[PDB]
Amino acid sequence: PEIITPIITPFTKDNRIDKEKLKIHAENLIRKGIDKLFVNGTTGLGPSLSPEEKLENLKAVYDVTNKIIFQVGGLNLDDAIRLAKLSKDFDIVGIASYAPYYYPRMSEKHLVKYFKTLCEVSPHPVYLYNYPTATGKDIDAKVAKEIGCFTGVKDTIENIIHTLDYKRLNPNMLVYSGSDMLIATVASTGLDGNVAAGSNYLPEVTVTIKKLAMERKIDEALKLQFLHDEVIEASRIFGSLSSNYVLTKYFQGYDLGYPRPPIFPLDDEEERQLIKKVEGIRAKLVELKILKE
Amino acid sequence: PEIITPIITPFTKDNRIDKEKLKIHAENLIRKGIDKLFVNGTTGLGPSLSPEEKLENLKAVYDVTNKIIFQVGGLNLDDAIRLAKLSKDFDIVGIASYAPYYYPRMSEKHLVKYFKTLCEVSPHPVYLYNYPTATGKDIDAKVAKEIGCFTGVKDTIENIIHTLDYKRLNPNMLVYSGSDMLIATVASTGLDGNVAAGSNYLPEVTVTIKKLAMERKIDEALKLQFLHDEVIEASRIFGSLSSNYVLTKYFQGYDLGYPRPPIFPLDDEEERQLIKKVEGIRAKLVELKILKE
Amino acid sequence: PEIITPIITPFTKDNRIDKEKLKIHAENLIRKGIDKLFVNGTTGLGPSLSPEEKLENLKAVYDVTNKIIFQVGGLNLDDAIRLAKLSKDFDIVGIASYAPYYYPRMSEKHLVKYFKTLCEVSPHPVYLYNYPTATGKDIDAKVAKEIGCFTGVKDTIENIIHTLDYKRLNPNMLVYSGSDMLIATVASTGLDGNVAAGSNYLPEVTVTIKKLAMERKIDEALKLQFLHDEVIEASRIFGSLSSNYVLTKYFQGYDLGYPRPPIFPLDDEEERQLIKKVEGIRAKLVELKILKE
Amino acid sequence: PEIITPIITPFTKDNRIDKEKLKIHAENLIRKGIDKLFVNGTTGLGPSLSPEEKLENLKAVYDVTNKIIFQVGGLNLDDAIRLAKLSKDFDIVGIASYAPYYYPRMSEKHLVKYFKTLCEVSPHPVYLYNYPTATGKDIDAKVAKEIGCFTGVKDTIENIIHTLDYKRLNPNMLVYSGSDMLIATVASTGLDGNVAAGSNYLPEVTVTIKKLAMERKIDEALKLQFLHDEVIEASRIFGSLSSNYVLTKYFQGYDLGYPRPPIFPLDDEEERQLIKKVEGIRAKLVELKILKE
């Protein structure tokens, strides 16, 4: 199994993508053993990015690595097709899309047509990003099999029965969980790994949970998983997508600038309070020899 | 109370806004007694429009009428602010925003800051568009009172107690329901009207229900309301946002082009089946002299 | 329209029904203008009562009035049939049942069979008690029509579109809301009234809201409804089913003993805090001459 | 880890517990390597049983084995206490309760008081049966820790993160999943076992999945788990609680009588459809030498 980072998009003080900070972060992740980068995902504020910005992200990250899954979806299918075709010139792992968001009660037929359209134009393998809470719909194992053209799926759902069903119905599909709290479990149970937001700021933790689980040291993997859980919980106090910026700077030592409002940056007091919540975990991770003092 | 149409955005065969068809539709709505037009709402595929397109819509409708509420929201707050400021040049009723959609677990503080930021830059009264199922969050009467700057609210929810609470906690606020099925009830219970997607295609019916209820002819209002409900139900069979185009052509006698994929147009057989479901209702409305033949 | 009280079951210190206290309460409600009493409902802790206790309740209340709807449902259909048959000797308004509770995902076929079975043995008109949050299932207007033997329905749901649909699909059916917060609206919009837990402790207020709305005095009805809403909210702080006992003693001046654990009685401090939350409302109600000192 | 069967309660034609069939079934399960029997759970229609019947089940099963966890909960706490106390004469594993069902919006304090009361009177270890969909409330890892007296938990929920959190916050608690579909995963990920309804009819399969997973033959375990999943899905088509009777007859060869209405037995057409869905699987299991005949 693999750990894949849904890489954060750093923004400047005037709300443009900070390409240089993005390259530094991508470089660090690969050097810490992250397998692939998922670009323009939720953690990277994909839905907040224009199609031009989604493409700018791909170009910046491609300067560092070809191990990229390029998320291209949105509510203008013409724009998503254009991004899919533009990716032809990039020797990457694949493209991906979440389901059309916002609109409630979209028919299965329309959801299927959206995805098959992307598959028909794609110059690369296509990955399903399934995220029912964010998009309002579920493209489950049965619907994925109907669509019939996915190389893999990232399933962001707490119900691992649903994630396992992709493998049951689609034995050749790569099946990843979008949970950070399921790294140990996913590795242990025969699935293909995790696309983990928290690997932006603790890539060494996420890779080590996976390694320990693979060695069948499940108790040691769970001890580490549970520490990582506490960091995820702390990130949720003030908003995880904002907090991820603060936590990357704290644990990794470089900054990723600003999020894009309405994902507002933490203020100084919130950042102080969050660091207070994770200080103790950092000390435990240093004692475990996962982080350097 | 008022009937407000969340106006359909007609798209051309090549997926651009058809300004001429939009003007023909807006004219017809105003002529048939609709109070105000809500532009770039769900029914108008607001979330599928770029900021430039949201402005193009405003410009087209504004050639017809000043009686506009201009929806401006989205996931790039700079773009929503720019649209709010640009509205200064238009003599319209107000601007509006739904809550930031897609991202789950957004903090109350960040939600409040989003709306307060728009209120601070707005040259017009600001209306809350509350739609929990579509956006994933609820800006309830309490949060609305804390935000403090709303002239009115459109509440799209399966819970009229929630809608009444805006009136209870904000006595001077205009409070509209986002449901076609609650026109009789809203008028009967002291609320301010309905922002009704079905008024795109049966403005005569929606205005008549409201009139009957204001005359205290509740049985007669209900009988008409219940007929309208059957049309609403028929529109949902193949997807209401797509079906609304077909129904407007059927009842109002002009074309509104296409929706924007992934809100796909109805195919020929779906259109045939939809018309079959409503043709008897059409005959009955013509026999009742609500529709002219 | 009518106000129907889902009458509280008073228990002794040793967890038996206090029949004499129940008779006091029932007499007061009727004398204060409540139209009918719904016995063994949620407010009466019906699911906590044995079949023998359900019958004891009917017998006690029948000593005071025959204006009774007798709730008989449960998870032993033989017991529910027995209670239904036993009611033949009581000249009451009807019997009622909620849907089988606890078990998730029971087929429509099985639900319809449960209700048709009760209808086939019933010596009285049968009323559907639909409460999806409590029972986990929804016997909607369509399923009610398929069952085809209900005289009326009490719909406990905040979605009034759902409640109106019973009238739309079953024009002869009596249709009541299970909400205290919808008395003004129900009365205004052509429905048949409310089965109102809060009418246990403020029957005067519920009857008055209904009267005001009937007289088309919608603003006065709403002002009173909104005051009643604050009492309902206060009751929810420590648990409504428990708080209803404290509130009845406070407003009506006799006690109703104890609830049945795990519906635990409020402690003295909780009772003191609840009283503090409602004493200002009591004062307004006195000044409006709705209550006497 | 363990496999625990929530044993089905067989009823006679006169709606009494069929003790002799119950005994034959319990003997078979123990003989086929089931670890423990969970008596009066959902699968045993516990909510449908009077306290007397709950005791009668315990006594019948105790004739066969002492490896029993005795579920005692319900909405009359005095009855639940009585059952807890009566268990003192039985040398069993533990007692259990689900949370008080039906009533929405019970306070955390009252739920905590319910469970602590049972712990105070229990002569045996106490197990939480957490089933939020059925009971309408969640007793999560934090509330379990607060209660502070559970020896174990059975978590029936679509959220393995939630189950893992009991281990994370209560490291010396036994933590079981209530899912048949997670036997391979539970064993792999360091959890304590599964209380699995499907083990009533395919105890051979459930025990073999667990063994393969323990041997770290995860792919072989998943292969067999995915066949078991197909049987579970089939059982849900017409209602699992009813289908469990038919499937026990079909796979183990003896019958378990009838369920208790409103859990109605499958009709002949439903039984035929159910068999058609599982006979291929039965053939597969015979070929794999998991089932003899």
From Swiss-Prot, chains A, B, C, D:
The keyword Zinc does not apply. The active site is at residue 154. Extremely thermostable. Pathway: Carbohydrate acid metabolism; 2-dehydro-3-deoxy-D-gluconate degradation; D-glyceraldehyde 3-phosphate and pyruvate from 2-dehydro-3-deoxy-D-gluconate: step 2/2. The keyword Lyase applies. The record marks 129 as: Proton shuttle. The metabolic pathway in Sulfolobus species contrasts with the situation observed in other microorganisms where separate enzymes exist for the catabolism of the two sugars, glucose and galactose. Involved in the degradation of glucose and galactose via the Entner-Doudoroff pathway. Catalyzes the reversible cleavage of 2-keto-3-deoxy-6-phosphogluconate (KDPG) and 2-keto-3-deoxygluconate (KDG) forming pyruvate and glyceraldehyde 3-phosphate or glyceraldehyde, respectively. It is also able to catalyze the reversible cleavage of 2-keto-3-deoxy-6-phosphogalactonate (KDPGal) and 2-keto-3-deoxygalactonate (KDGal). It is equally active with both D- and L-glyceraldehyde. Homotetramer; dimer of dimers. This is 2-dehydro-3-deoxy-phosphogluconate/2-dehydro-3-deoxy-6-phosphogalactonate aldolase. It comes from Saccharolobus solfataricus.
